Every structure is written in structure tokens, then in C-alpha cells.
Amino acid sequence: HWGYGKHNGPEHWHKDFPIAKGERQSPVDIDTHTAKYDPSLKPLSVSYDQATSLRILNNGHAFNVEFDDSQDKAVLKGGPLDGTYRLIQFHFHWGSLDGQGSEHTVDKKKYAAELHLVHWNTKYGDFGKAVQQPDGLAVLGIFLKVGSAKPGLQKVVDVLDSIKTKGKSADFTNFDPRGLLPESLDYWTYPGSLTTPPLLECVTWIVLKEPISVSSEQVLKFRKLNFNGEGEPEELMVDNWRPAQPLKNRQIKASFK
Numbered sequence: 212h213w214g215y216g217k218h219n220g221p222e223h224w225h226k227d228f229p230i231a232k233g234e235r236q237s238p239v240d241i242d243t244h245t246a247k248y249d250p251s252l253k254p255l256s257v258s259y260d261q262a263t264s265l266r267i268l269n270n271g272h273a274f275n276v277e278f279d280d281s282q283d284k285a286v287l288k289g290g291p292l293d294g295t296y297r298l299i300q301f302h303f304h305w306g307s308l309d310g311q312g313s314e315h316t317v318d319k320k321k322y323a324a325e326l327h328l329v330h331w332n333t334k335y336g337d338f339g340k341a342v343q344q345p346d347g348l349a350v351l352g353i354f355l356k357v358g359s360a361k362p363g364l365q366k367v368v369d370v371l372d373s374i375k376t377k378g379k380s381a382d383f384t385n386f387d388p389r390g391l392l393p394e395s396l397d398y399w400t401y402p403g404s405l406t407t408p409p410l411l412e413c414v415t416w417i418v419l420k421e422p423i424s425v426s427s428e429q430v431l432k433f434r435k436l437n438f439n440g441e442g443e444p445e446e447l448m449v450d451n452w453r454p455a456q457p458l459k460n461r462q463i464k465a466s467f468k
């Protein structure tokens with residue numbers, strides 16, 4: 212099945228998921244000079260004060276920090292969005308080397324990793340019905356660069372050794388995703404897709420301009436995770452990013468001058 216290696220990586224995914232060569236695939240390169248400022252974008256509203264994390268899971272492709280999305284807590288609205296989108300999980304994509312890892316790129320620059328905070332449009336009732344709709348998801352994408360540590364990330368880094376391999380989970384309560392956000396909410400936005408199979412075209416992407424800084428030791432610990440299950444040959448969970456896809460008939464809009 213699918214993954215990130217030579218035989219089952221991004222160049223292969225189209226055979227099981229033909230939408231891989233669709234009209235609104237993600238990620239894309241963000242050409243900052245041609246992304247036009249849109250003064251009709253309303254400001255972005257991230258309301259994470261009542262977020263309830265539950266668990267962290269190694270799914271064999273990344274790790275997910277999962278949230279209780281059974282009530283009106285942890286919502287994203289405003290910006291380009293009509294309505295309210297509820298946080299369900301976040302995960303990262305990262306590299307084997309600090310010079311690569313992000314899925315979106317900014318004027319072809321690759322960051323060391325990228326955070327995806329995944330939210331579903333509450334008008335569709337749950338995640339599974341929302342990924343059947345073209346406006347079902349909003350993903351807040353945040354770039355990571357290597358420099359100073361991100362103190363708000365440490366509780367995640369410290370739990371990773373308990374979920375080394377595919378299928379492992381760990382209780383992960385009371386984690387506050389506000390500690391993963393940069394100062395500014397200036398962003399670029401465009402219509403796209405999941406960047407992993409099943410590659411569904413449901414996503415309004417909101418990619419923050421300001422990266423967060425994480426330390427070299429924090430990212431090194433992401434790179435000790437494993438794609439394989441326990442008892443299987445070790446394959447380090449690194450380079451779980453899809454490269455940029457054709458922009459096709461899309462415009463990227465900037466929230467800022």
C-alpha cells in the first residue's frame with residue numbers, strides 16, 4: 212500500500228488514487244509575488260481555548276494528536292471561510308535533513324517541516340461526511356524552521372518514544388495547540404486537497420506566512436519514529452512529504468500587503 216519510498220511513494224499514488232492528477236491537488240508552491248492581496252478576506256479566528264486533546268497515534272505515515280470533536284470547542288472561522296470548522300487532529304510532515312520536509316513551499320523554499328491542524332465544516336455534521344464535500348475541510352498549515360526550541364511542542368516530542376512504531380497510541384490529554392502557533396496569523400489561501408491518500412479535494416488551505424522555530428533536538432526526535440510496525444525491519448519515519456503539484460486553474464490569495 213502507499214507510502215513514501217521508491218516503490219510506493221508519491222509518483223505511484225495515482226494508480227490507486229487517480230484524483231492524484233486532479234484539478235486541485237496539494238501541496239503547491241506559493242509564488243509570493245503573484246499571490247494577490249485580497250482586502251475582502253475577513254480576519255482569521257482561531258479559538259482553541261477549550262480544545263480537548265485525547266490521544267496521540269502513529270499511523271504508519273505520520274503521528275496524529277486527536278481531539279474530542281463531539282462539542283463546539285476548538286474552532287477555526289473567518290479568513291476565507293464561510294461558517295465554522297471544528298478541530299479534529301493535527302499532524303506534521305518532515306524531512307530526513309533540515310533542508311527539506313515541508314509540503315508547501317514559498318518561492319520554492321522548503322522548510323524543515325510543516326504542521327497541519329485539520330478542521331471539518333460543522334454544517335456537514337462529522338468528518339466523514341465533510342470529506343465528501345468540496346468545502347468540507349479547512350487546514351491551517353504552519354511551517355517549522357530549525358533554530359530556537361518551541362516550548363509548546365515539547366510535550367509532543369516527549370511522548371514519541373511511546374509511539375515509535377505503526378499502530379501504537381498513547382493517552383495524550385490536556386495538550387494546548389495554542390502553543391504551536393506563531394505570533395502573526397497573516398496567511399495565504401487557496402483551494403486544494405489532502406496531501407496524503409486518499410487525496411480528497413475538500414480542503415480550504417490557510418498557510419501561515421510566519422514559521423515557528425523548533426530546535427534541532429526536537430526535530431531529531433521526530434526522525435526517530437518508525438514507518439514500520441513493532442517487530443519489523445526498522446524504516447525511519449522521515450521524508451513523509453509530497454512535493455508540490457501543478458497549480459492548474461487556481462489563484463492563491465494573501466491576507467496581507
Ligand SMILES: Cc1ccc(O)c(S)c1
Binds near residue numbers: 327348350404407414
Ligand atoms: C487526514 C488528513 C486531513 C487533512 C490533511 O491535510 C491531511 S495531509 C490529512
Ligand SMILES: [Zn+2]
Binds near residue numbers: 302303304327406407
Ligand atoms: Zn498533512
